[PDB]
Design a protein around this motif. Structure first.
Motif, short mmCIF file in Angstrom:
data_model
loop_
_atom_site.label_atom_id
_atom_site.label_comp_id
_atom_site.label_asym_id
_atom_site.label_seq_id
_atom_site.Cartn_x
_atom_site.Cartn_y
_atom_site.Cartn_z
N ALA A 1 -2.80 11.85 1.43
CA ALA A 1 -2.41 10.89 0.39
C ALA A 1 -2.57 11.47 -1.00
CB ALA A 1 -3.22 9.60 0.53
N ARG A 2 -3.54 12.37 -1.19
CA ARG A 2 -3.75 12.98 -2.50
C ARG A 2 -2.58 13.85 -2.94
NH1 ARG A 2 -7.07 15.40 1.34
NH2 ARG A 2 -6.65 17.63 1.69
N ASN A 3 -1.78 14.35 -2.00
CA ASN A 3 -0.66 15.23 -2.30
C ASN A 3 0.68 14.50 -2.28
OD1 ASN A 3 -2.45 17.44 -2.51
ND2 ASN A 3 -2.33 17.79 -0.29
N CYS A 4 0.67 13.18 -2.34
CA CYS A 4 1.89 12.38 -2.36
C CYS A 4 2.01 11.66 -3.70
CB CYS A 4 1.91 11.36 -1.22
SG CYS A 4 1.92 12.08 0.43
N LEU A 5 3.25 11.50 -4.16
CA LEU A 5 3.53 10.87 -5.44
C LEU A 5 4.60 9.79 -5.25
CD1 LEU A 5 3.62 14.18 -7.43
CD2 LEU A 5 2.02 12.33 -7.96
N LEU A 6 4.69 8.90 -6.24
CA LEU A 6 5.63 7.79 -6.22
C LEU A 6 6.44 7.77 -7.51
CD1 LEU A 6 3.02 5.23 -4.96
CD2 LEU A 6 5.04 5.83 -3.64
N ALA B 1 8.29 7.38 -2.19
CA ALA B 1 7.21 8.33 -2.02
C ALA B 1 7.77 9.72 -1.74
CB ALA B 1 6.28 7.90 -0.87
N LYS B 2 7.14 10.73 -2.33
CA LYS B 2 7.56 12.11 -2.16
C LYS B 2 6.34 13.01 -2.05
CE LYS B 2 11.55 11.35 -5.22
NZ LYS B 2 12.62 11.99 -6.04
N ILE B 3 6.44 14.02 -1.18
CA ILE B 3 5.42 15.06 -1.13
C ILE B 3 5.48 15.86 -2.42
CG2 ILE B 3 4.49 16.96 0.23
CD1 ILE B 3 6.14 15.88 2.60
N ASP C 1 -0.13 9.37 -8.15
CA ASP C 1 -0.43 9.83 -6.80
C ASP C 1 -0.67 8.64 -5.87
OD1 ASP C 1 -3.53 9.65 -5.90
OD2 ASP C 1 -3.43 9.87 -8.08
N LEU C 2 -0.56 8.91 -4.57
CA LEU C 2 -0.56 7.84 -3.58
C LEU C 2 -1.95 7.26 -3.36
CD1 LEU C 2 0.86 6.06 -1.65
CD2 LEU C 2 0.95 7.92 0.03
N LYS C 3 -2.98 8.12 -3.29
CA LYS C 3 -4.33 7.63 -3.02
C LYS C 3 -4.81 6.71 -4.14
CE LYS C 3 -9.00 9.15 -1.82
NZ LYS C 3 -9.05 8.37 -0.55
N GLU D 1 -4.64 6.42 6.04
CA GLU D 1 -4.92 6.28 4.61
C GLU D 1 -4.07 5.19 3.99
OE1 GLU D 1 -4.62 10.66 3.55
OE2 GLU D 1 -6.32 10.08 2.28
N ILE D 2 -2.80 5.12 4.38
CA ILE D 2 -1.89 4.14 3.81
C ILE D 2 -2.33 2.73 4.18
CG2 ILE D 2 0.48 3.28 3.85
CD1 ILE D 2 1.42 6.15 4.23
#
Ligand SMILES: Cc1cc(-n2cc(C(=O)N3CCOCC3)c3ccc(N[C@@H](C)c4ccc(F)cn4)nc32)n[nH]1
Length: 277
Positions: free
Chosen positions: A144-149, A158-160, A97-99, A199-200
């Motif tokens: 950011a919690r709902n994004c993945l790499l 990065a993707k939702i 996840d992104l965060k 956040e990023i």
């Protein structure tokens, strides 16, 4: 759900060809699994202890994610509803996840991420959001919690990766007309993306750091906005503030945000800026 589509149309993969290697995260647990040569997937689970609305919440998610076709949106590999507990098979993205990624790759004595890498992550999400807006879908939880790499190295995408809030509250991510009026348009996602931009470029900090929910409510409604993240450049912060315009009629669409993110990539004074430690 229509994007026209019924549970008819999903790919029902038999439970025999599914097993779950390890746990990943948790509403309801989510694991890493295998299918079929082996195929590596992520498995979202509906706990068998559930109600009726939980069921039509779980499948709801399945048809929505299965109707998407975009490179910046998590792919739906398959579905396992006829076996309890019911599964949703999803694209496995090794980057996590992104965060977590930004807080763990935060530079420290090393040269982990430059600012060009974060502009790519933001544009990846902005391009996915442009796909949702063009097809008239409102996410309601761009965070950011709902994004993945896909991967952790350079060349990550990065993707939702979740549509929990888009069932049918994240106060810190929502515009005034959302938390006060219950109105949701494509400009609601524009506000949330602006909070995601923060956040990023803060590298995983919690927005409105020492503010609770109602503090943010009264702060945002009275006109207050967050300060720039540490070492954040001008053109980037101006995209955040343009996303945080009070009247949704003045926030930009995701085609305009994509252009402005592109120009910062074309700015050496932006991409040569040093991230803090
Ligand atoms: C649908 C999906 C999830 C996912 N995934 C990959 C993780 C990962 O760390 N990996 C490193 C080690 O190798 C395996 C991959 C990961 C960690 C937590 C998590 N939590 C869930 C609640 C979640 C769902 C959506 C979302 F946007 C954020 N979080 N999901 C993770 N990939 N695909």
């Amino acid at each position: 759900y229509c994007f026209t589509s019924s549970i008819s149309d999903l790919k029902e993969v038999p439970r025999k060809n599914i097993t779950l290697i390890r746990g990943l995260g948790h509403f309801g647990e989510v694991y890493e699994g295998q299918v079929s040569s082996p195929l590596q997937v992520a498995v979202k689970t509906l706990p068998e202890v559930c109600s009726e609305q939980d069921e039509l919440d779980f499948l709801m998610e399945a048809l929505i994610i299965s109707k998407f076709n975009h490179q910046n949106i998590v792919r739906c590999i398959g579905v396992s509803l006829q076996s309890l507990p019911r599964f949703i098979l999803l694209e496995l993205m090794a980057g996590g996840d992104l965060k977590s990624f930004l807080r763990e790759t935060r530079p420290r004595p090393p040269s982990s991420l430059a600012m060009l890498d974060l502009l790519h992550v933001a544009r990846d999400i902005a391009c996915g959001c442009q796909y949702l807006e063009e097809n008239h879908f409102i996410h309601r939880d761009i965070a950011a919690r709902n994004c993945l790499l896909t991967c952790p190295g350079p060349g990550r995408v990065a993707k939702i990766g979740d549509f929990g809030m888009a069932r049918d509250l994240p106060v810190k991510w929502m515009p005034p007309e959302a938390f006060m009026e219950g109105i949701f348009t494509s400009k609601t996602d524009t506000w949330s993306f602006g909070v995601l931009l923060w956040e990023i470029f803060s590298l995983g900090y919690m927005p409105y750091p020492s503010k609770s929910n109602q503090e943010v409510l009264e702060f945002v409604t009275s006109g207050g906005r967050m300060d720039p993240p540490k070492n954040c450049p001008g053109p980037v912060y101006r995209i955040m503030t343009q996303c945080w315009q009070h009247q949704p009629e003045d926030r930009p669409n995701f085609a305009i945000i994509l252009e402005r993110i592109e120009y910062c990539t074309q700015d050496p004074d932006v991409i040569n800026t040093a991230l803090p430690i």
